Amino acid sequence: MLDAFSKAVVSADQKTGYIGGAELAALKTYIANGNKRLDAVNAITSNASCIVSDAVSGMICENPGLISAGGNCYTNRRMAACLRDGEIVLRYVTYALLAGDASVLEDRCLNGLKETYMALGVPIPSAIRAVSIMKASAVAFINNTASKRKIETPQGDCAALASEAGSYFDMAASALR
Amino acid sequence: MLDAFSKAVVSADQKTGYIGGAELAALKTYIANGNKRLDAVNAITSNASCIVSDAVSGMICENPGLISAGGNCYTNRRMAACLRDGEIVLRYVTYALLAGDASVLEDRCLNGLKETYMALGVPIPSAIRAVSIMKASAVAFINNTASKRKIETPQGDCAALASEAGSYFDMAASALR
Amino acid sequence: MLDAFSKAVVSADQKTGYIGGAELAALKTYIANGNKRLDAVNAITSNASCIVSDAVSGMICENPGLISAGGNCYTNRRMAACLRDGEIVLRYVTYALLAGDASVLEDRCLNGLKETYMALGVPIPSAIRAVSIMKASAVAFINNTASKRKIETPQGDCAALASEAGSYFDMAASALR
Amino acid sequence: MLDAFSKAVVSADQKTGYIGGAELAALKTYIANGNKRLDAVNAITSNASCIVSDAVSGMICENPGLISAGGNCYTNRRMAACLRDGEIVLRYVTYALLAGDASVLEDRCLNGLKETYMALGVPIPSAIRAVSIMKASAVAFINNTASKRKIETPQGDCAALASEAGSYFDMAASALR
Amino acid sequence: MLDAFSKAVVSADQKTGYIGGAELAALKTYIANGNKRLDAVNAITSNASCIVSDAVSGMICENPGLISAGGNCYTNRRMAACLRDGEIVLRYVTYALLAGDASVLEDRCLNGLKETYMALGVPIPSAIRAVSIMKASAVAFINNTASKRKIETPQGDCAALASEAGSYFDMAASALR
Amino acid sequence: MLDAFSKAVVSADQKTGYIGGAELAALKTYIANGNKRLDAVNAITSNASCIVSDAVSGMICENPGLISAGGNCYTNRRMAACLRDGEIVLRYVTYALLAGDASVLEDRCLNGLKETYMALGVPIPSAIRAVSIMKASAVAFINNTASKRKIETPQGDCAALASEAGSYFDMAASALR
Amino acid sequence: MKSVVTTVLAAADAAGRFPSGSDLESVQGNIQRSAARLEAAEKLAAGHAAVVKEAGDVVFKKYPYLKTAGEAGDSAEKVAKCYRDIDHYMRLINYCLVVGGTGPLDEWGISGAREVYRALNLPTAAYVAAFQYTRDRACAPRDMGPQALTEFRSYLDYVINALS
Amino acid sequence: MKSVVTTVLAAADAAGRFPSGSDLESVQGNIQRSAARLEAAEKLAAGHAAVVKEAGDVVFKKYPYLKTAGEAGDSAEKVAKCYRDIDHYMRLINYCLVVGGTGPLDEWGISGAREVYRALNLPTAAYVAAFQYTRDRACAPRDMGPQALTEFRSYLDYVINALS
Amino acid sequence: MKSVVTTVLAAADAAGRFPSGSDLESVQGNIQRSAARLEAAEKLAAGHAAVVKEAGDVVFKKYPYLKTAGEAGDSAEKVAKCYRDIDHYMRLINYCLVVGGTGPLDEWGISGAREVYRALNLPTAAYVAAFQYTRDRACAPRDMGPQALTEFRSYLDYVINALS
Amino acid sequence: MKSVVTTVLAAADAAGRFPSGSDLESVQGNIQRSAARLEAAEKLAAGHAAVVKEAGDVVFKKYPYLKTAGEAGDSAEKVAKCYRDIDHYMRLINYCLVVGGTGPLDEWGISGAREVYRALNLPTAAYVAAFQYTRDRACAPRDMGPQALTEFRSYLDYVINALS
Amino acid sequence: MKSVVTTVLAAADAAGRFPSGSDLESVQGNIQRSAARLEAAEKLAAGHAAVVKEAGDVVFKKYPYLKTAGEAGDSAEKVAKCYRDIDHYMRLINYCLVVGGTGPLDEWGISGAREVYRALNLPTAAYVAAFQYTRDRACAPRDMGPQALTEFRSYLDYVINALS
Amino acid sequence: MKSVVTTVLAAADAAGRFPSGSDLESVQGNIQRSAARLEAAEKLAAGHAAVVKEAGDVVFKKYPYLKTAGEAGDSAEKVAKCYRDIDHYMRLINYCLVVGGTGPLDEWGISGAREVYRALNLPTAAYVAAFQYTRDRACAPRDMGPQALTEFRSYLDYVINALS
């Protein structure tokens, strides 16, 4: 996998170039925002169980056919598998947010997932909705706007981090379309 | 795998329904015919070696090209493989007849078999003939009409069981077409 | 794998025929040329490291883009992999020349190689050039016409053996086209 | 593993003898008591989770040193492992009771267990107590004398089955001494 | 494993010495007797099935307790295992004779065999007799003195090869004591 | 494995105690010396190849019997294995120094090593000398007293770290006695 | 799906064997026991409405805390899902009794249950109370014969043990 | 040893399961079919010597080439071993009939037989003749009841197929 | 035991590598974050008895059904074990705060907990209530500094998620 | 297909090696022994008709029971298949002699043979009699030289051992 | 590519874990050490021309035999490839300093190097001389600060050890 | 130890086979080629001291940088070890020539050599020079016959390629 720094290294290498002043400055800013990034990750991990269960339950309450006879969340075995998948995706999203790069998520989670779901009969529109709810959830916790649970951090702005996190959930959705 | 009873359970589950009077009556009849079914299975297993060797030999005597140079039963190694396959199919047919359901045969034997045979160059029309001869054979033993060997059972009618057995051999043939 | 003798056996078997006078005479000639064949093999193996390194280096000096950024021999890891592949092909060519038959080369090396290279992004025209240089190299050593290193053997003619060796390198090239 | 019948077969085989007459009479009586044996097994399996948790908790309430730091049931991981072993032993005892022979229990559970417990530092006197509590418990359920939960069976006497079940728990304790 | 030549190399290496002169003379004589050695090996392999079945049957006819209930050749499974071991030992003896050195036999067959036989309850005196009968048999075929089957070889003397073959059977017996 | 902090946790746990006050003070001092510890580790890893080759060569120059025929460093394969072991031991010592605790070294390297060396015929007094030379070497680099290569660090005293590193090499030697 | 016949067939298949005497004999046992368990199945199929309502009512009488804010019965819709779950389990029990083994419960009711109930704050003791009540409420000869009762109670105990 | 109960217990053990409904039901099959097979076992125990003599006599009447030089019946001691082997198999059939499974035949008679008989020049057709004759010589109700006869013949056919 | 240094050393060991730059850099992270978590560890060491009593009181105030017959708090000795367990977890949190990782909780508190609590009818919601209350009761700068509070709360949330 | 060269090449390939001295030297042995075995091949190719007829005639002279109802030679068409089988084997022996190893027999004659002959009631002793007769009938110098005879007899013994 | 974060993420992924305290703490260490190594990266990026020229000049001053016929510097074009290689390595060192771990060197410089240099007659001592000179030529505070120097020298030593 | 016979025996052993025709034929190859290689072995045994001195002299004449400070020939004892190593290899070649295979070189000279020579700063080109010179210095019929020379040179080339 790559992180924000090794990603810049891959670009420099494509040009047989050294990384110096110009390119180094954006990375120093990334470092300066490091404490916030750590808080953003802690905001998701600290609420992982809640994010997943709320998203799968929301997917279901908006489409009750999923828990009807022959729905793909019907039986405890399928419901448990779906909750597990929700957690897997969230876990890889937190990896991406800690690394500052999507490669761990794309390579180890999203690659092949659409094909897996098509072969199993897992309904993709419903999965995309579960992912969307987790996105709303995770972003609210990063921004400290969650309705029922707050997180105390030093006062400031995490909009870029919330957008970056959102983008990783959007890549999950895009990989299934 | 499924049996006759779990097959009815799968149907009831598709309807979120309990199994009661109406649906239970056909299954009680299945139970009442249970001793006959056991005899039908014993009729095939007791003659397994004869059923297989006669069918493969018959396939060959009707198509001597199979044991000519480059025929698919040419060499002891291929002849042994074909005899083995004859026995495998017969074994899964007896499983189906004991269970009262084709799923063990379809899932564990017939799924992928056509593709396997096409990749190997195993001639499918000839395999279908071997299966047909085993069908004639197995059904005669169930009905106690085999020319050279009899089986003593209480007097009665096993026509439905013979037809059911025949249908499992027909599914083997259909899976290769 | 087959050798020159088992290849003749496979042909006789396709005809349900015994191998006798007529067919046996060409094989006796093969045996009579056996010492030369052994020398031909020794000529390649004794120079294996030189054949491979010269061919890969020649491929590169004729196409310097291979060692530019993103070239397929760029980084020590890729250069080492390519040298390894050069050696693998040469090794299977020597196997074929010792056996007097291409089957070991086709079955254990060339089958699937084009697909492997296409999946990896290994540039096939460049591989074909590496193989061509090894061919020139190996044939010169067999004929004792290499510019910088000689091999002392009894005086005579190895043109057929050099052509046979050349043909195995040509089959490597053909399997990639 | 052996059952009650194959145990008889092994003894007859040591004498090169057929089973008839007197040997058969004891076995026919075993069959006649078969329904009671099925109920005896049902008695234990139906209460499995209760037998195990009560025995391990009982071992602990009588020796609370086991849950002090450096006691062998200290930490959830150790307590879980001990509850698991309780269940394993009870499971093999129910196997022995269904089979009417201790071999499954001796061969698959008890053989090597003392040495395992000695190597791990598992306190054998405590393990023996846990086994003794499960014995009291299981026997009570077989006899329908359990204080908090009854089982409805046809009236009669299961003293021999209760002693036999007890003998299997006793073998487990003997195996650890 | 070692052969006769590498055995010499190991001794020379212990002395940091080159092999020339007197060391070579014995080895040149080994080569000169090579055709006889090939015939000696052919003598045993050509009669392998006969040597083994006669030795095991001989062991048994001299000690019929072996086939009584609780004898170690009782049941077809035990008799098959014993015949298999006979064949294994004979096979490794032929390897040793082809190599001109016992190492293959000691390292791959005889090392651990006594302990295996002791752990299984295989009667070692009986095993030693089976080995002794195979010795008599194999030596007879090498010398062309077998009562029911002759082998045509060029006239001469194979006494040294017969003693050497005998020495390998003797090593097997010594390994079990 | 444990580190310096988890070692403290294990002791506190044996007493069912929380870590505060006096326990914490020693640990806070450990943290305060952390930069020096990182430099100490860097001192050894930066010179790893030099420490190992010098120690093994030193062992040999003081006991040239080791490279005579039948010495344990005779042949390139043995010399390579010995150099490898030198590197393995040094690696685990650097792990122990980074962790501030010997457990990684004891559990993953030293446990079973005496018995391995005894079974192989590896001369333990020679191995102990190789360890002693690496000790002298590693300690010199930590203290910046190595004769041919210096390391620039902020001025101060690393005596405690040098003794601790020395203690780990001493544990390796003790493990072999 | 685990039953008498699928278990002997899976063992035969693993060993590459035709059905043999012990396999047929096993299926005979299935024939003998069928009347008792199918009696139980039929009674449950005819009576499930009242059985499910009693069981659900008992859950919330035993554990009225479930109706408090933040708990599993804190809306009418969640209370209904609880009764639904009980209905699902009783249906799976009907299926086990028809099949003559635990397959339907194992696959469709028990597998993954602990994970789901943990994730959704659904206390296992609530489910256990439902089944314990159901088990002990039933009686022979009124509701079914004694061997049918043994069969019915065996699957209830089976689910109780899987959740406790 | 393969029987009704050892097969269901080996499957429960491989899954880490207590015995459940379908295991108990399988064992009830034991109880139903035991009378037929124990009747066959008893008749065979009482009559084995006469049955074995008939079968061995039939072998050498069918295949008198066995008594010629270099063949399996070419000494009195080898002929006696033949009749002994037939007795061994009938004793193993008695054991299968008692156990309710093929285990005793599988482990003590069939495993390794092909390797032994090949090594010792013992034609399998000779054994098949002995068992086919025995199977078809027996009749009900003369020698045993109809269901006992079905059991007896099933194990004879089992052996025939194992040697075929 | 999972910590900064044992994680980088286990990865180096699996690759046969000496510690390198990124391993040393990871350990520097230790040195930066230690003040915040050791402050939390010390405050918890000093105040654990009062924190545990508050948490246990909250459990039985929230779930008084625990004190009724057949439940986890239905004797004085069982109630006392509850408060003891809360103390065990807080002690393990003290240890995690000292180590700088989840190792002590993972190995000594979480592993096997679900199996134990199921066997003993210990509702996980009771434990979650204790930890949620503790997490939200603490505040900075009153009880500890802001970053110490972040560390304290992270391990409480870690446990909550392990029981959820 | 097993021969001198394919065996050394398979060993070289498994070890990732170029052919080396012992490999070339092995092939030299093949050159030395070729005259004897190719002499044998050539004699067999020229004389197979009479060899096959003698062998088949000997089978049925030794075992006239084969012609009786229910046996392997009980029709003219089955008798012909027997002679055909002998012809197949003699052809495979010709191929082994040409290749200088057992490959042709192993792959096309021996593999699966015991299974086929068991299934079709084809006694292995019949085949053994054919080959033993063929082996002992041949002589040097009349039919071939002595080393050619050794080669011819070695493959006959090889098939005899595979069937006995 | 090995760095502080990818190493902790690979360990988390192998154990199926979310990032936890020791993982975040590791990344904090990366933040602390970044100023020193990025200073070093920046100096190298600005000064690489003169660094590479000095290193190459030193190779051929130390080992003038390289310019003799049949050796690695025996043409102008091969001499240039040597300086190019040094440039490649210095670029990879710049990348390691930016990433804060050895990944760029491991993957793009070291893996396969020994095999390539062996095949092409490129003595490893030449490369070692280049890096040893570069390491010892640098000084603080002139070229960079002391901690930047430690970082720069650590990666040079890392490549020296991989080649020796 | 790799030789003609150990290679065919290891292949027979892996297949559970007796030695067969192609194994015996391989060993005949031994008998044909032995004269040429034993002649080479004897000449080398008689002349090894002079051959080793020539080769070592050539190494230090080609690469006088080896005698300078910090290099492999920078003391009298290190120079003496060089000549000793050349003698070790020639002795291993004597052994390969006796055995008829690469085994002695493989096991006692080549395995681990690259790791040793890297650790000890021993340039492989120095060894290659010694063997190339020796290979090309020898001639037939002066030093040995033509085929003996082919054998001698083959093992020298074998070593050259193992160090290349």
CSV table of C-alpha atoms in Angstrom, one decimal, chain E residues 8-80:
chain,number,residue,atom,x,y,z
E,8,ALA,CA,35.7,-42.6,-1.2
E,9,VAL,CA,35.4,-38.8,-1.6
E,10,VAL,CA,34.1,-38.4,2.0
E,11,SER,CA,37.2,-40.3,3.3
E,12,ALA,CA,39.6,-38.3,1.2
E,13,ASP,CA,37.9,-35.1,2.3
E,14,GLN,CA,38.4,-36.0,6.0
E,15,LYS,CA,42.2,-35.9,5.1
E,16,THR,CA,42.0,-32.8,2.8
E,17,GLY,CA,43.4,-35.2,0.1
E,18,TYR,CA,43.0,-35.5,-3.6
E,19,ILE,CA,42.0,-38.9,-5.1
E,20,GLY,CA,44.7,-40.4,-7.3
E,21,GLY,CA,47.0,-43.5,-7.4
E,22,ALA,CA,45.9,-46.2,-5.0
E,23,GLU,CA,42.5,-44.8,-4.2
E,24,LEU,CA,41.7,-44.7,-7.9
E,25,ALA,CA,42.8,-48.3,-8.6
E,26,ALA,CA,40.1,-49.9,-6.4
E,27,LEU,CA,37.5,-47.6,-8.0
E,28,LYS,CA,38.7,-48.5,-11.5
E,29,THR,CA,38.2,-52.1,-10.5
E,30,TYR,CA,34.7,-51.3,-9.3
E,31,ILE,CA,33.9,-49.9,-12.7
E,32,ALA,CA,35.4,-53.0,-14.5
E,33,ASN,CA,32.9,-55.2,-12.5
E,34,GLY,CA,30.0,-52.8,-13.4
E,35,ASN,CA,28.3,-55.1,-15.9
E,36,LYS,CA,28.1,-57.9,-13.3
E,37,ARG,CA,26.6,-55.5,-10.8
E,38,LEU,CA,23.9,-54.5,-13.3
E,39,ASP,CA,23.1,-58.2,-13.8
E,40,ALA,CA,23.0,-58.7,-10.0
E,41,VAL,CA,20.4,-55.9,-9.6
E,42,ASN,CA,18.4,-57.2,-12.6
E,43,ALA,CA,18.4,-60.7,-10.9
E,44,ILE,CA,16.6,-59.3,-7.8
E,45,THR,CA,14.2,-56.8,-9.5
E,46,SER,CA,13.1,-59.4,-12.1
E,47,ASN,CA,12.0,-61.6,-9.2
E,48,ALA,CA,10.8,-59.0,-6.7
E,49,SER,CA,7.3,-60.2,-6.3
E,50,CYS,CA,8.4,-63.8,-5.9
E,51,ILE,CA,11.1,-63.0,-3.2
E,52,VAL,CA,8.7,-61.0,-1.0
E,53,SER,CA,5.7,-63.4,-1.1
E,54,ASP,CA,7.8,-66.5,-0.5
E,55,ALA,CA,9.7,-64.8,2.4
E,56,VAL,CA,6.5,-63.7,4.2
E,57,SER,CA,4.7,-67.0,3.5
E,58,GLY,CA,7.8,-68.8,4.7
E,59,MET,CA,8.0,-66.7,7.9
E,60,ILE,CA,4.3,-67.7,8.4
E,61,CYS,CA,4.5,-71.4,7.6
E,62,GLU,CA,7.4,-71.7,10.2
E,63,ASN,CA,5.4,-69.7,12.8
E,64,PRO,CA,1.6,-70.2,12.1
E,65,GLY,CA,0.9,-68.2,15.4
E,66,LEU,CA,1.4,-65.1,13.3
E,67,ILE,CA,-2.0,-65.8,11.6
E,68,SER,CA,-4.0,-66.8,14.6
E,69,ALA,CA,-6.3,-64.1,16.1
E,70,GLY,CA,-3.9,-61.6,17.9
E,71,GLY,CA,-1.0,-62.7,15.6
E,72,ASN,CA,0.6,-59.8,13.8
E,73,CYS,CA,-0.3,-61.0,10.3
E,74,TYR,CA,-3.9,-61.7,11.3
E,75,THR,CA,-6.5,-59.9,9.0
E,76,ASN,CA,-5.8,-59.0,5.4
E,77,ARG,CA,-4.8,-55.5,6.4
E,78,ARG,CA,-1.9,-56.7,8.5
E,79,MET,CA,-0.8,-59.3,6.0
E,80,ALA,CA,-0.9,-56.5,3.3
